[PDB]
Amino acid sequence: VTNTEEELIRECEEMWKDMEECQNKLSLIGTETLTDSNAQLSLLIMQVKCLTAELSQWQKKTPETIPLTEDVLITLGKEEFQKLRQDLEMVL
Amino acid sequence: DRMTLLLRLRAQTKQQLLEYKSMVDASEEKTPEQIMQEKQIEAKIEDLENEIEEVKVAFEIKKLALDRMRLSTALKKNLEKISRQSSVLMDNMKHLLELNKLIMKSQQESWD
Amino acid sequence: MSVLRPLDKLPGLNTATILLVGTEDALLQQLADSMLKEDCASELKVHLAKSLPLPSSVNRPRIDLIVFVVNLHSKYSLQNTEESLRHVDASFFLGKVCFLATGAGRESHCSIHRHTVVKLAHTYQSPLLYCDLEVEGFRATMAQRLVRVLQICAGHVPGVSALNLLSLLRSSEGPS
Amino acid sequence: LQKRLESVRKQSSFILTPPRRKIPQCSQLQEDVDPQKVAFLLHKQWTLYSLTPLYKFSYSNLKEYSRLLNAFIVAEKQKGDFNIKVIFSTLLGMKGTQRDPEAFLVQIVSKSQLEGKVLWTGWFCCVFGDSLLETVSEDFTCLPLFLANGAESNTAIIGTWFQKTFDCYFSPLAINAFNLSWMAAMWTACKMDHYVATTEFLWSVPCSPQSLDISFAIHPEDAKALWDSVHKTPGEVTQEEVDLFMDCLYSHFHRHFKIHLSATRLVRVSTSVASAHTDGKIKILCHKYLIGVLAYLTELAIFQIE
Amino acid sequence: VRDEPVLLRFYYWLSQTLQEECIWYKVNNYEHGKEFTNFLDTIIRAECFLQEGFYSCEAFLYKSLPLWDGLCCRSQFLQLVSWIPFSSFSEVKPLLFDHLAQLFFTSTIYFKCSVLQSLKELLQNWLLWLSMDIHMKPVTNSPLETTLGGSMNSVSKLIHYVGWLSTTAMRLESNNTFLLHFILDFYEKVCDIYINYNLPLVVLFPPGIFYSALLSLDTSILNQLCFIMHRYRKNLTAAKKNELVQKTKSEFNFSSKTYQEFNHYLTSMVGCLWTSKPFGKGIYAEYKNSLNVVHHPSFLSYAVSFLLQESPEERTVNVSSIRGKKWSWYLDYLFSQGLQGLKLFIRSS
């Protein structure tokens, strides 16, 4: 349980380095305000640029092989069985 | 229980990293901007939200299928060998089968 | 400088915030006290604001949600909000700006039109909700409603993003 | 029934008031309009109510309805001699649209125990109420607006009688504080070359445990020179003309006292034309612009029904 | 009585009753709200005795759904939306379905279950009127296939909107079974449209509901999934008999996109139960036997209890050798507990 803890410390450490690399690329983009005369055009044209931006990203991501071996899924399964027992009392 | 904290902060960090990467891909990738009508723009909005809903239910059903296969093999290796948690796990399965038998009789009488 | 952006710094570890923007100080304080009654799995940090642009503070976290509590019995809450949405970014309007029009239960003493805040939300692409914060039973329904928006904008659920909240809160009249 | 369906969808949508309105014309009194009747209608205190359209109303059955009303309101005072008698008087020539039904007058005039003293005055009318006429049948008579003069206990015992005979129900009328600013801008859009009163405004502060009132007076020759600098497109009163006229009145108050009155609530507008209040109290002080105000009150009275 | 001024005067009274004597127009009295709760109990028994909603009551919900928050007699307000009569789909969605979806994804899950209990009673009374509207109209000499075809896309976009409400709110709560019982109770109303209502339209749900119910941890969700898919076979093959008669006139025809989609549902569910090939097109050392009838975790409670009732002096646990003769004894124990929908599915499909 301790070695699968420190694997999840290290996998959350390397994606913390991924987001601060994305934070340093995002700070170069400056200020962009919005007026009243062209507010319907400056929010819907960029939504076409916004919905295209994760269309490549949700298709790049595979079903992720999360490395878990033993003694986490058993303890999460008993917590799942404890909430399944309360849900079948409430639906009764 | 620290493993729920590790999985919840891992899913939160994955969601924040995915929305940061989509914000960087929105700031760095552009479209050709022309003079267009509004209804073709909202038609592209509804077609893109149908396509992004299709790939999000594809990723959700494949990730949930991998999770249920790992939980099925984890419960198979759990109930292969008799352990010390069986004395409450057998009582929990007996209470779940009695509550499910009551839900079967209630569903049959309610349907008739 | 005196600008606002939702993405400059780090949020933290299971910690979100909310920027309560309004003119009334006794009405938004009871909304701020009622959000701490409904418990959750995240640390809540309620920020109270008068009018945008804010003063240059350096101890501010990453902002996940800015609500604009306008009053339907006051034009002073509307004219400060019109000066508030000039100094904003277009990345706030991807599902991170909610509106609250208080005074909707009293249709005898109202001081601005209902179609005005619809037209303010239609050209700026923001969801519009109506609630009366003078009733303590209505305020706990409102304080439940600010938490489940803040679970989306902080990214505490898998699969639902901030622009997924904008697609669910759309408003369009029937073309027939 | 299909035009009853199309009037719901304008009320179900958020749009119900046009942003560009017409300046009201000079309503000249015709020869069919009685001059001695309209002087009695002026300088009186009125309470407004809205009403659903009536059933089996005829113009020749008023003699039977006068005897049933005189036998009932004496009896309601006995359950809790009276020399009172109601008069159903019909007025002519007030209508501008020919499809409107005829308005009439209901008084209570005391008899001569020695003209009697009028204790209560009821008035049913429909001035430019054409949007509700095609939503009713031809059996229905559409008189939405009602004005009462007198005590509220005499209103409830006669308003009981319209519930049990004509299958209707009275509701209290209320005008919003947003809609007082449009009718104040309409009263400053008038044309005058005669004796005028003072434009009186009154705001109330909602953020107090007690009441706080501000009396505010504007000279109307100073109001007319303030209006035409704002009013630049003639013939139409727009959305931006009224909201910039209220903003320069608020900025005139702001440089002296540093109190924002745009957070407050406007409750009383009294000009040279008429005086208004939010709960339905009106005092019409002009006869040349009589039906222009009363068509605007039927413009609100259909909206509280629908 | 279908007289016109007896219904317009009832419209003119009760619209003024709900407007003046409402909740938020008062000074927050609990005693007048109890009488307003007692007045709404008279309305919900009068709309059910008449079997059509009043024209005052749907006009009040046009003006109150922007003004409602989600509490303060929720159960009397969600039954007031349950008996609204049928209209067009484009008129309901700016006035009801936009203001419902602003409160559906944001309130609690007891509100999320009470919307789908209200919409399954809305799917009762709308399909009850459309089942007998064909019978009581011999007047129009024109064919009614444009009017039934105009009523076809009004109700198929109804179920695909609530099916879009069901597969999005599953992602919000992240697979709770308490919402999943009342999604499949809403499709119990869908799957009885040709047998009980005689309406020639077969609509299907997107498969985010399907693999969340197939891979659920509950036996009763798997019984109701095998109940609806048994009803989907008897609705579609009887519509194949409707396609075979109406081929010579080319009037009542179905598209070929619902036959290839239904083949994707039937092949993928027998690969997770019977064929032992769980990887298909939607889903892409015992990975071929991780998902079976006896290897599913909801039926694993019956798999442990089968080996205890055979011999309660056990030493090893062997759940993978249940084949042949004691596999029929394992199906005899599952059929006796009340799995009647799985018994009718295995004898037909």
Short mmCIF file of C-alpha atoms in Angstrom, two decimals, chain B residues 5 8-9 11-13 15-16 19-20 22-23 39 42 45 49 56 60, chain C residues 7 9 11 13-14 41 62 154-161 164 167 170:
data_model
loop_
_atom_site.label_atom_id
_atom_site.label_comp_id
_atom_site.label_asym_id
_atom_site.label_seq_id
_atom_site.Cartn_x
_atom_site.Cartn_y
_atom_site.Cartn_z
CA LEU B 5 -7.50 11.01 -1.55
CA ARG B 8 -9.53 12.01 -6.14
CA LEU B 9 -6.54 14.37 -6.38
CA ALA B 11 -8.59 12.74 -11.18
CA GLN B 12 -8.71 16.45 -10.19
CA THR B 13 -5.14 16.98 -11.47
CA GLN B 15 -9.12 17.29 -15.20
CA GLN B 16 -7.14 20.50 -14.54
CA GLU B 19 -8.59 21.84 -19.37
CA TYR B 20 -5.21 23.65 -19.29
CA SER B 22 -7.39 22.54 -24.13
CA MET B 23 -6.90 26.21 -23.20
CA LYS B 39 -27.32 29.65 -37.58
CA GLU B 42 -24.76 27.22 -33.90
CA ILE B 45 -21.81 24.15 -32.16
CA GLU B 49 -21.07 18.97 -29.11
CA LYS B 56 -16.59 11.40 -24.21
CA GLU B 60 -16.09 6.88 -20.40
CA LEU C 7 -5.81 31.42 -15.45
CA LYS C 9 -1.54 31.02 -11.16
CA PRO C 11 -5.50 26.78 -7.75
CA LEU C 13 -4.89 21.15 -3.59
CA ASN C 14 -8.69 20.66 -3.24
CA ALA C 41 -15.44 17.60 0.21
CA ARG C 62 -6.94 31.27 -8.89
CA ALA C 154 -13.01 23.61 -10.17
CA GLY C 155 -12.95 20.28 -12.02
CA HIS C 156 -13.88 17.99 -9.12
CA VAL C 157 -15.88 15.54 -11.27
CA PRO C 158 -14.50 13.43 -14.16
CA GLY C 159 -15.65 14.12 -17.70
CA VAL C 160 -17.54 17.39 -17.09
CA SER C 161 -15.52 20.51 -17.92
CA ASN C 164 -19.70 21.48 -20.64
CA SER C 167 -23.68 23.77 -23.19
CA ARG C 170 -28.13 27.28 -22.99
#
